[PDB]
Design a protein around this ligand. Structure first.
Ligand code: F6C
Ligand code: CLA
Ligand code: CLA
Ligand code: CLA
Ligand SMILES: CCCCCCCCCCCCCCCCCC(=O)OC[C@H](CO[C@@H]1O[C@H](CO)[C@H](O)[C@H](O)[C@H]1O)OC(=O)CCCCCCCCCCCCCCCCC
Ligand SMILES: CCCCCCCCCCCCCCCC(=O)OC[C@H](COP(=O)(O)OC[C@@H](O)CO)OC(=O)CCCCCCCCCCCCCCC
Ligand SMILES: CCCCCCCCCCCCCCCC(=O)OC[C@H](COP(=O)(O)OC[C@@H](O)CO)OC(=O)CCCCCCCCCCCCCCC
Ligand SMILES: CC1=C(/C=C/C(C)=C/C=C/C(C)=C/C=C/C=C(C)/C=C/C=C(C)/C=C/C2=C(C)CCCC2(C)C)C(C)(C)CCC1
Ligand SMILES: CC1=C(/C=C/C(C)=C/C=C/C(C)=C/C=C/C=C(C)/C=C/C=C(C)/C=C/C2=C(C)CCCC2(C)C)C(C)(C)CCC1
Ligand SMILES: CC1=C(/C=C/C(C)=C/C=C/C(C)=C/C=C/C=C(C)/C=C/C=C(C)/C=C/C2=C(C)CCCC2(C)C)C(C)(C)CCC1
Ligand SMILES: CC1=C(/C=C/C(C)=C/C=C/C(C)=C/C=C/C=C(C)/C=C/C=C(C)/C=C/C2=C(C)CCCC2(C)C)C(C)(C)CCC1
Ligand SMILES: CC1=C(/C=C/C(C)=C/C=C/C(C)=C/C=C/C=C(C)/C=C/C=C(C)/C=C/C2=C(C)CCCC2(C)C)C(C)(C)CCC1
Ligand code: SF4
Ligand code: SF4
Ligand SMILES: [Ca+2]
Ligand SMILES: [Ca+2]
Lengths: 31, 139, 172, 46, 80, 42, 61, 42, 31
């Protein structure tokens, strides 16, 4: 039994935080 | 303006491009004793007229090659000059710089980019780390 | 002794300048070729950039529908093939318009480099202003969409148009 | 020519032989060479 | 532009100046050699980096050195 | 059948397109070309 | 014009300071909105065909 | 059936939307953004 | 048996030769 719709959506929402932090780190390194 | 008549040439695809009108262009002028056939720097054959001739070119190397390998070496013409023409019409005579050919030593010419040592005494790059100076530019 | 015979030369220097990297040929300088090229919407005198873009878009979006309709992967059915052709035309035109937009964005900063500088004399590239490029792009997009939709409507109604052009609508 | 060969490769890999450039798919008949063959055959009466 | 340097081993043979296809070098008075002249590169902005001068230089090691640097329109040898 | 225009001759699709082209598609652009030609200032 | 569109106004958030700019804007708004609405309408009208398109169902034949 | 792409996993419409988005919808805007970034005058 | 598809297409291509020559003569006479 694989994960459900809610788990996929929760993973997608959680992955936003590393994405934003990666953008912040990239812009800081570009400085 | 630069005086002289263009050599007889039926046209070609090795002439000037957008760079001539946008960034810079070069003009080579000379004087020949007679009308005679020479080779254009970018292919083809042209006929230089008996009077004073003026030729438009895209690169300085074209003029240097034409003046040295053809005008002096073959046609025994030594009075050629190369000018750099900017789009705004400003023209500077760039070859020869002081009226004397560079291969002939002339008084008053300063030493430029001279290093007061043999090439084997250049410092190692580890000496000049983060200092921004190259080993050949080191004092 | 030396005779270039330029006066009797069928191929002359372009516009009287022997050093402009061009020739006077039947393609570049014949009256018919000159008239046809200079009266295309890209070069027609007096046209506003939007109208140039509109005409070019109509033509291009019109003929871009056909290839996927005929030899596309949805060609087994008429309606699917027409939809695929319209979608392909729309995608190509939108990509081209995005390219035109970014070309206008990057070319016109300060004095543009190359053929779009203030001192450039490129007769084949007359759109020297950014606003002209944006008007042209708007015209291109609208015309391309209109031409693609016109071709799609003609192909979707192929049976009706075939009856139309054969007089089959006059039975009743 | 070569991109069409690659197209044939990809179409065959997809299992879409009907989309290939072939005698049974999208045909590319060399009609001029066939016509020359027919003319040269009929010239002698065969 | 490229950088052209002349070291004190120059013998004033004028070969590098003759070999240059863009007139970057010239001979200037000097006292460090018998020929009483030394090469100079006042016009390195026109240097293309062909290294014909290095090929023509007879000293061992080279008395003239070319270091390729930032590329410009004329250093790339572009007619367009 | 005789309920539509047809052609038993070869390439019967040619009149299907040539008749619209010559009689009500191209003539207006042709008139436009002539109008420009006869109205051009000297 | 009164308010933020006067000649002496410095409203950086309202840069369309000319009447002709607003009419050019409006022409683009209308034509763009009609085209975008029709584009969405065409995709939804063809939802069954597009669903087969995006699932590879058009490659059966 | 095996005549179409399907998914027995949760939210099988997600590939259906994301494959076009990542591979032939967003990439051209991303290329345009990069082109604007690398062509900006100093 | 009337002419075939190829014969009609050949005639159309051949007719281009007098078509272009007619344009050349018309423009020459206009001079
Ligand atoms: C790949 C390849 C390829 C392909 C594939 O294979 C194709 C296809 C195809 C198909 C789909 C179609 C047919 C269909 C039939 O048959 O049937 C219907 C018809 C009808 C309906 C028709 C009816 C009648 C009409 C409407 C008329 C017309 C009009 C006009 C346009 C106007 C004119 C204006 C002025 C005067 C000019 C078509 C068409 C085409 N085109 Mg193609 N293509 C290609 C290409 C091209 C190129 C290059 C070019 C040039 C640019 C081109 C052009 C053109 C033109 C113009 C055209 C027309 O019109 C048509 C139409 O759209 O239609 C609607 N292509 N297309
Ligand atoms: C331009 C490149 C090109 C080249 C080098 C060839 C070469 C060849 N073709 Mg070929 N062909 C081409 C394009 C080309 N083809 C195109 C575009 C088509 C589609 C109409 C064909 C259709 C075609 C057929 C049906 C056959 C060949 C055949 C052949 C072979 C015999 C030559 C011959 O007389 O064929 C005749 C070829 C033609 C009449 C094609 C017309 C080519 C014209 C000159 C080019 C016009 C289109 C141009 C690319 C677009 C113009 C751009 C615009 C800016 C002006 C030879 C290897 C024969 C073969 O396979 O023999 C074994 C054969 O039967 N060709
Ligand atoms: C002067 C000769 C002549 C005349 C009066 C006609 C008359 C006709 N042709 Mg026709 N035709 C001709 C020669 C001629 N043909 C030739 C030589 C060809 C082979 C290239 C064709 C191929 C042809 C096709 C394929 C079709 C017709 C069709 C038709 C009919 C409709 C008109 C049309 O679509 O034209 C079409 C004409 C062409 C595609 C090419 C015409 C080429 C000729 C030589 C041009 C003559 C110009 C003329 C001399 C200059 C006039 C000067 C002015 C001061 C009057 C009409 C009865 C259509 C038809 O059958 O409808 C039922 C049709 O579909 N023609
Ligand atoms: C680096 C890890 C990684 C990799 C290589 C893949 C690879 C793939 N994923 Mg995926 N995914 C991941 C993590 C990853 N996943 C995570 C953590 C999630 C939960 C948020 C998802 C959620 C997800 C969904 C919902 C779907 C895919 C799908 C896919 C496939 C098509 C690509 C796509 O649509 O991306 C979609 C990607 C996302 C929606 C989010 C990705 C988030 C990751 C963490 C970003 C990683 C960035 C990377 C590290 C930076 C690269 C730097 C560069 C220098 C290389 C492909 C096999 C599709 C599929 O199954 O097709 C059959 C699909 O529909 N993925
Ligand atoms: C204008 C130029 C194009 C002129 C096209 C004229 C075609 C005349 C067809 C009229 C007869 C139809 C009779 C009914 C039977 C159906 C039939 O035969 O379908 C005629 C078929 C089209 O097939 C039809 O397609 C439709 C698409 O939605 C539907 O699927 C129809 O059911 C299907 O029959 O013709 C072709 O396959 C065309 C082949 C490709 C032609 C390329 C033309 C390129 C022109 C470039 C030059 C122009 C600029 C210079
Ligand atoms: C679906 C995924 C699509 C691809 C990802 C998104 C692409 C575009 C993202 C950046 C656009 C805006 C640029 C910064 C906005 C901006 O103007 O920044 C300005 C910033 C600093 O610029 P300067 O130092 O020249 O100073 C100019 C001043 O105006 C600002 O300081 O420079 C950059 O462009 C940042 C570095 C390049 C970009 C680094 C990598 C990009 C992000 C990588 C991580 C992505 C994570 C995604 C999580 C969802
Ligand atoms: C389907 C058929 C549609 C109708 C036929 C085509 C209509 C348009 C054709 C001409 C357009 C461009 C005009 C010339 C291009 C052009 O600019 O030419 C310029 C030419 C010379 O003009 P000038 O002497 O004033 O010099 C101006 C300079 O720019 C050129 O020397 O004057 C004309 O207009 C030519 C004579 C009028 C036209 C004579 C009759 C037209 C041809 C008749 C035969 C047609 C055969 C068709 C075979 C396929
Ligand atoms: C479900 C849901 C939702 C949605 C969500 C979403 C839409 C999501 C998305 C997500 C995503 C879409 C994400 C992404 C992420 C990303 C990432 C995670 C990335 C990372 C990266 C990295 C880490 C790297 C970096 C770097 C650096 C550092 C530097 C250089 C450059 C580069 C880039 C390489 C909502 C809320 C509406 C509602 C509820 C439910
Ligand atoms: C068609 C048309 C035309 C034209 C147009 C144009 C002119 C266009 C342009 C366009 C363009 C102009 C485009 C562009 C594109 C771009 C691209 C495609 C890019 C890409 C990029 C990339 C891929 C990147 C990469 C990288 C880098 C470099 C850095 C970082 C890393 C990476 C990897 C990201 C005209 C008007 C005549 C007319 C109408 C039609
Ligand atoms: C050079 C020449 C030629 C060629 C030609 C061509 C290439 C043509 C093309 C043509 C084409 C390709 C055309 C097209 C046209 C188009 C059109 C005419 C369109 C129109 C459109 C419309 C009308 C639209 C409308 C709309 C809109 C706007 C929106 C809403 C919807 C609708 C749809 C209503 C030939 C070889 C023959 C001969 C020699 C010379
Ligand atoms: C901020 C952001 C975001 C958001 C976003 C959004 C809100 C988006 C939207 C989007 C959209 C909402 C889009 C849309 C688009 C559209 C289009 C792309 C359209 C197109 C169109 C067309 C192409 C048309 C055409 C036409 C015409 C013109 C006429 C005739 C007909 C036709 C149809 C052809 C998110 C949260 C994610 C993340 C964070 C950040
Ligand atoms: C089949 C085919 C094709 C097509 C073709 C075509 C499209 C054709 C057309 C054709 C045509 C469409 C033709 C036309 C012709 C015309 C003519 C032949 C005319 C003539 C005229 C005349 C002779 C007269 C003149 C005059 C004079 C002299 C002076 C005054 C004015 C006038 C005009 C009266 C192609 C190659 C694609 C491919 C292969 C197959
Ligand atoms: S590298 Fe070439 S152009 Fe530069 S100085 Fe040496 S010979 Fe002259
Ligand atoms: S640098 Fe070399 S080639 Fe030039 S003058 Fe000195 S020894 Fe001669
Ligand atoms: Ca009726
Ligand atoms: Ca299919």
């Amino acid at each position: 039994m694989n994960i459900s719709d809610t788990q996929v959506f929760v993973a997608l929402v959680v992955a936003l935080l590393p994405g934003l932090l990666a953008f912040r780190l990239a812009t800081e390194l570009y400085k | 303006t630069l005086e002289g008549q263009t050599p007889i040439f039926g046209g070609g695809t090795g002439g000037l491009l957008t760079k001539a009108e946008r960034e810079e262009k070069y003009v080579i002028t000379w004087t020949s004793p007679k009308e005679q056939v020479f080779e254009m720097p970018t292919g083809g054959s042209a006929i230089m007229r008996q009077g004073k001739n003026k030729l438009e070119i895209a690169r300085k190397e074209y003029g240097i090659a034409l003046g040295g390998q053809q005008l002096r070496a073959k046609f025994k013409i030594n009075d050629y000059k190369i000018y750099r023409v900017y789009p705004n019409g400003e023209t500077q005579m760039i070859h020869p710089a002081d009226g004397v050919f560079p291969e002939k030593v002339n008084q008053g010419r300063p030493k430029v980019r001279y290093v007061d040592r043999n090439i084997g005494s250049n410092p190692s790059p580890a000496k000049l780390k983060f200092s921004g100076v190259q080993p050949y530019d080191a004092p | 002794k030396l005779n270039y015979r330029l006066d009797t030369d069928p191929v002359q220097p372009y516009k009287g300048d022997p050093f402009n990297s061009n020739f006077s040929t039947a393609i570049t300088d014949s009256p018919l070729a000159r008239a046809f090229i200079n009266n295309l919407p890209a070069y027609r005198k007096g046209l506003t950039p939007f109208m140039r873009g509109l005409e070019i878009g109509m033509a291009h979006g019109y003929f871009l529908v056909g290839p996927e309709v005929v030899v596309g992967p949805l060609r087994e059915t008429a309606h699917g093939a027409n939809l695929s052709g319209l979608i392909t035309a729309i995608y190509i035109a939108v990509s081209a318009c995005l390219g035109i937009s970014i070309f206008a964005i990057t070319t016109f900063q300060g004095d543009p480099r190359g053929a779009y500088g203030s001192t450039s004399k490129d007769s084949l590239r007359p759109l020297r202003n950014r606003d002209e490029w944006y008007q042209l792009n708007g015209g291109i997009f609208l015309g391309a969409m209109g031409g693609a939709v016109f071709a799609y409507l003609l192909l979707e109604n192929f049976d009706a148009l075939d009856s139309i052009l054969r007089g089959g609508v006059n039975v009743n | 020519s070569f991109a069409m060969y690659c197209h044939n490769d990809t179409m065959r890999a997809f299992g879409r032989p009907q989309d290939m450039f072939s005698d049974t798919g999208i045909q590319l008949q060399p009609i001029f060479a066939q016509w020359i063959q027919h003319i040269h055959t009929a010239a002698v009466g065969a | 532009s490229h950088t052209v340097k002349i070291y004190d081993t120059c013998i004033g043979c004028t070969q590098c100046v003759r070999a240059c296809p863009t007139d970057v070098l010239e001979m200037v008075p000097w006292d460090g050699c018998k020929a009483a002249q030394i090469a100079s590169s006042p016009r390195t902005e026109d240097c293309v980096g062909c290294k014909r001068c290095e090929t023509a230089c007879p000293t061992d090691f080279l008395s003239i050195r070319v270091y390729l640097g930032a590329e410009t329109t004329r250093s790339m040898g572009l007619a367009y | 059948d005789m309920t539509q225009l047809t052609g038993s001759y070869a390439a019967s699709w040619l009149p299907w397109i040539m008749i619209p082209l010559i009689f009500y598609i191209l003539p207006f652009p042709v008139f436009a070309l002539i109008f420009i030609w006869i109205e051009k200032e000297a």
